[PDB]
Subunit: 288 residues, 4 copies
């Protein structure tokens, strides 16, 4: 065969049962399009999203798409993680078929529902759902490395879905100590040890989660407003951190600041973040 | 003297190229982002000229930042040429990095050609476009630079329909070092890569000639996508097996043989950019 | 609770594998350095056993440190096996990283065989050595590890002449990820690399089978150097052209066909380690 | 041809005029052997050193050897830089032919001439020669990146020769800002910005020179005695530096400490180091 990907029958989807449709957008690393997959699971046609390469794809783009597919299989299913539905890997272009999220990414979702709509309780719920998704990811021995609001999708029923696992790693046995340089990660979401010390652990993902929390409570704001990525390397070393969002309580801001402790072991674990957010969410949810 | 900690930024000064931030007004958008802008005095010290500004986005990675800085550095090394987008200035101190370059009102070549397909491009125009690009590459090669990302999407077109080679973020300076067996090329567009760039960890001017051949095919197909119907996923093996693209409809046998020569498996058997310029000049004259 | 700044070291704890520094006495030397040592209680809690300790040198690089840590991590993943050098313990806290492993009194296989060439090795011994190594690799592959650096110099021999696969610094865990198109392999020994590892940015268990074939050749030549008279400098092109090593003098047609099968260009056409073990067991029994 | 290296006639040496001899040692990345080259320059046979690959050479080893050859051609000739004499690049294994230094590397040279022989003036002279070599290298727009005593050779006439350019880079036009990760450089000779900030400049080589100075004045001592490379990353960030060698004056120790300023622009330039060392050397040299 002229193709290269190995067979994995349980996940393979027939190409003649997939109808590609409207493009959902370009990621410079490939493209996602809406599609109809018959019997992907009932011989019913369900709307899905398909990720594939563009004509100017590089070997890194191809390896990233394949890595994302492999990581999703390892992670497994979870309410707060975009679900892998199947793939077309044989006799043709690589198609990774995933759950379609009609409301788009979290940043645009929040920006479109700003006040002159999102309620404070809705923001806490979003944060809780994502903490649960990350707590699950970490328990599956996966480090995401690219947790941003743009990389979270929202379903028609407003469910938060962590997505974009192309940069994620499997740390079940190897932790890449001193060999993960991290030059392809978004600087404004990176923990200091990821930027300077060639490591990346679950605690580094906790730092990114703190930045994601800030994005949520600013209803889709861009991190470190007015501070170019160009001067952030030295500012971070100097202890500078983002300020408190207007629609954030002291308790939630202290949580963000704790995720940003310089010492990784001083940051909360995702298990602890889930416990605290469950308490806060419950108390902010009307019980009448 | 300078006190310590005056700037938290990192780029060194280069006064001759530095442009005042207060003289630049960023406009509508057009790895990073490019936006139109007005630059006062970059040319008449009071006249505002329309330019393009490349900068980082909020989700910039260290590779993105190093690529933008590398592009700026390569443009200074290469120097000015009619068929290369020219660097006009840069804001590198006390703020975000802005690389200011010539604005090309007609967009990239791919789109340019696609929008001018028969229902306004003439055969002579296609040959002219190809010759201009061969001249730009001959100059770039003489300046000891390998571009590595030559595609029609990376060629811009000005108001006066001048072809401008752009996007030097992946380019390398091979004046003294050639990166033999240490350039893995995983960030280059597969459909434009020579076999030795894909498999053998090298990249020479002859690898750019292979890319030029693909660009020629894109041009004579009026912005068509290379290896139609062939996924990049199976191209690695097809290329080793000797497969090559077919002749575009609006292409003469002479021009197609030129493309095929750029795709010889053995790099030294491909023409040099100097030879391509000489041949295209002759063809253009006889057209 | 723990106060901050108690340790300036970086490795996380793993108690079950940690060995007391005061129970380890470093001896004479044997990327880093390996030295003999005496470890009290690593086995009788009062008995000192002779072991080998791998550690960094004063000119260690971050790659050297990450490689030593990776080797330690891979050995824990792989688990114990008769034909794999076993990990005994490690000192990772409050001091230099010491990876403590089984001491093999007879050195590496290359030297072992060279010192036993006819003026004490028998044909049966060579087959036995090969089978033992096939068994070790079959186990490693079942544990979803790709070694990537299988050479006779990376095989150690114990006092009881047991073959032990060693040097897991370049090994990878492919339980869930296979590194497709992202493993460039520039740090692997060229003369032991499968063509797809050299040219196609992949590495699978079938690539280790190719290396195993080269190891078989090293074994039946009593520690000879692969591709004699052929510089690594011209091997890239020779390999693409289909060239393969000749049959060693002390090798039967059957064993040579096995080597040639490990060197099939198409990876799926090579035997699996499981098949190699089954075939070698039969040959060994008929010898 | 089955080989890959391009021709460069002016430097090519005939293989039949080169006789390989005794091995000078293994560098794990290749091997160096003594040899006789006839007419390499007079049809006289001069003793030279030849660097070549070993049978287990990797692609990095091959690319490093070729890079070293290319860098030496760019640097040019200098009294304090090991001289490239020629190479055999066609129709056979790559041989890079260089000046033979009979006294070996500087670390062993100093250790073999310790006191129960080196004089203090000799140590200052060694340091001055190396500063001159580096001042020249930097003016040629080259960053060495691997300046250690083991990487300095000494000739029969006690001339200091900077060697091992396999990790060096040409920064005539490109400076590799934020794209030089430096994971293959010896940690104990690395400036903090080289370790943490993905950059490498001439000022980073000045830091390494300070460590080399310490090696010289301890007569071949190993840097950061008793401090494992494993804990140096955090100790460096915390401002820790090596102590003053016994046979070092306050003036020379202040020079070392200045080479180790955390801020690169605060370190002296090689031009300044050469000027100060020339003064110190002159004053320590008997003028009777
Ligand atoms: C941030 P980027 O690299 O563009 O990210 P990507 O290219 O994956 O997505 C491009 C567009 O398609 C959207 N998108 C990606 N995956 C899905 C999906 N599964 N369902 C709905 N929209 C998606 C994404 O939010 C964005 O609007
Ligand atoms: C190939 P890519 O990564 O999209 O390239 P880039 O990130 O520079 O995208 C810039 C967009 O604006 C266009 N563009 C880039 N530079 C200029 C310029 N100097 N003048 C006019 N248009 C430009 C370019 O063709 C594309 O449409
Ligand atoms: C192939 P290399 O990089 O030399 O490999 P290494 O750096 O481990 O060198 C170690 C030296 O001591 C030998 N050696 C390594 N490990 C052991 C061991 N566990 N027992 C006995 N000898 C060993 C090894 O064969 C070589 O001679
Ligand atoms: C530190 P390493 O990697 O072994 O360094 P290398 O392998 O280049 O050198 C190995 C041995 O050969 C010595 N050597 C290298 N080059 C020369 C030379 N040009 N003249 C004399 N000895 C040399 C070097 O000092 C050491 O003793």
């Amino acid at each position: 065969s002229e193709y290269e990907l190995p067979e994995d029958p349980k996940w393979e989807f027939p190409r003649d049962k997939l109808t590609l449709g409207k493009p959902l957008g370009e990621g410079c690393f490939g493209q996602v399009v809406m599609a109809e997959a018959v019997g992907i699971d009932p011989k019913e046609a369900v709307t899905v999203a398909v990720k594939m390469l563009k004509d100017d794809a590089t070997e890194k783009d191809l390896s990233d798409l394949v890595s994302e597919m492999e990581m999703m299989k390892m992670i497994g299913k979870h309410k707060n993680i975009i679900n892998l539905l199947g793939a077309c890997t044989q006799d043709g272009p690589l198609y990774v078929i995933v759950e379609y999220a009609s409301k788009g990414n979290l940043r645009e979702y929040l920006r479109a529902r700003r006040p002159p709509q999102m309620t404070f309780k809705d923001l806490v719920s979003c944060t809780y759902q994502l903490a649960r998704g990350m707590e699950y990811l970490a328990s599956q021995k996966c480090i995401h490395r690219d947790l941003t609001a743009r990389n979270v999708l929202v379903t028609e029923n407003n469910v938060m879905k962590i997505a974009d696992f192309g940069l994620a790693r499997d740390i079940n046995n190897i932790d890449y100590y001193k060999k993960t340089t991290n030059g392809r990660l978004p600087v404004k979401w990176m923990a200091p040890e990821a930027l300077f010390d060639r490591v990346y652990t679950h605690q580094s993902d906790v730092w990114s989660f703190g930045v994601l929390m800030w994005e949520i409570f600013t209803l889709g704001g861009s991190p470190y407003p007015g501070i170019p990525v160009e001067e952030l390397f030295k500012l971070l070393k100097e202890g500078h951190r983002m300020d408190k969002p207007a629609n954030c309580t002291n308790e939630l801001y202290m949580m963000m600041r704790d995720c940003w402790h310089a010492v990784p072991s001083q940051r909360p674990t995702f298990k602890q973040l889930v416990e605290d957010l469950d308490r806060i969410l419950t108390l902010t949810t009307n019980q009448e």
